[PDB]
């Protein structure tokens, strides 16, 4: 997360860490949507152009975390994956259309003050909350900034980072990139002359872009950090996998499996 700040403890109890077991590596973010299911981006699990294709045994999930640098035994929960489900029409070769995947835990995880599921929006929530100017929140342990060389590497925080960002109007999202955008994504971020800055970044993929509903004051996951060109670049915006748009697939998966 770029230009965000340290999260308050338990401020994002649905936050999940997708972790490569060996060689150890924090791969991406993810979100808890029930005691057995975790939502993340497809490209974190499968992305041929980078020789990425992780199977269940290569990974684990770390839930309830605050600091990345140590195992937090009183709040943290580690889960083995029983099965990964990438969206069958996940378009990796072109524009990450439908960048979404589900991971079923082998066992249900117990909830606590630090582990709690986020809500998925229904048609109207999507319709009423996804408006230009409305702000959502993005969290993660990804990089703090775009670096001058890909090799510079990773500048990661120790504590979960949070940043609030405004949804931008589709014509602007479209004109901002040459990548073909689709109705299954939306973009968020401040415009060049809005002053404020902030964006998600490498390592944030799969994390939730949540919104608090003014009607029932529950938190809804409207997006999934998916892609962007650089991080926090002017006239550039982060892109998120539109969750309501892919909700029928999510429900079919959950109702058919586990």
């Amino acid at each position: 997360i770029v230009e965000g700040s340290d999260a308050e403890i338990g401020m994002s109890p649905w936050q999940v860490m997708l972790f490569r077991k060996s060689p150890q590596e924090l791969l991406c973010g993810a979100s808890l949507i029930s005691d057995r299911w975790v939502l993340t981006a497809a490209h974190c699990l499968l992305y041929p152009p980078w020789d990425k294709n992780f199977t269940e045994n290569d990974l684990l999930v770390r839930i309830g975390k605050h600091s990345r640098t140590r195992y937090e035994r009183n709040i943290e929960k580690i889960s083995m994956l029983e099965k990964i489900y990438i969206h069958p029409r996940y378009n990796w070769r072109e524009n990450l259309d439908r960048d979404i995947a589900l991971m079923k835990l082998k066992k249900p995880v117990a909830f606590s003050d630090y582990i709690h599921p986020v809500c998925l929006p229904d048609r109207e929530t999507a319709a009423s909350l996804l408006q230009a100017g409305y702000k959502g929140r993005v969290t993660g342990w990804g990089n703090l900034k775009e670096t001058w060389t890909a090799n510079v590497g990773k500048g990661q925080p120790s504590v979960l980072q949070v940043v609030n960002l405004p949804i931008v109007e589709r014509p602007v999202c479209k004109d901002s990139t040459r990548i073909r955008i689709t109705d299954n994504m939306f973009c968020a971020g401040y415009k060049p002359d809005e002053g404020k800055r902030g964006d998600a970044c490498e390592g944030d993929s799969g994390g939730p872009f949540v919104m608090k509903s003014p009607f029932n004051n529950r938190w809804y996951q409207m997006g999934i950090v998916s892609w962007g060109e650089g991080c926090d670049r002017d006239g550039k915006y982060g892109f998120y996998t539109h969750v309501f748009r892919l909700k029928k697939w999510i429900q079919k998966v959950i109702d058919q499996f586990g």
Partner: peptide, 28 residues
């Protein structure tokens, strides 16, 4: 357990707000 989804044990359930939550509400 999506019945209780989206309600944070350390915030909503304790009637406590977080430091930037208000910024979102005002955006509406």
């Amino acid at each position: 357990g999506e019945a209780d989804c989206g309600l944070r044990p350390l915030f909503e359930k304790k009637s406590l707000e977080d430091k930037t939550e208000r910024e979102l509400l005002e955006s509406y």
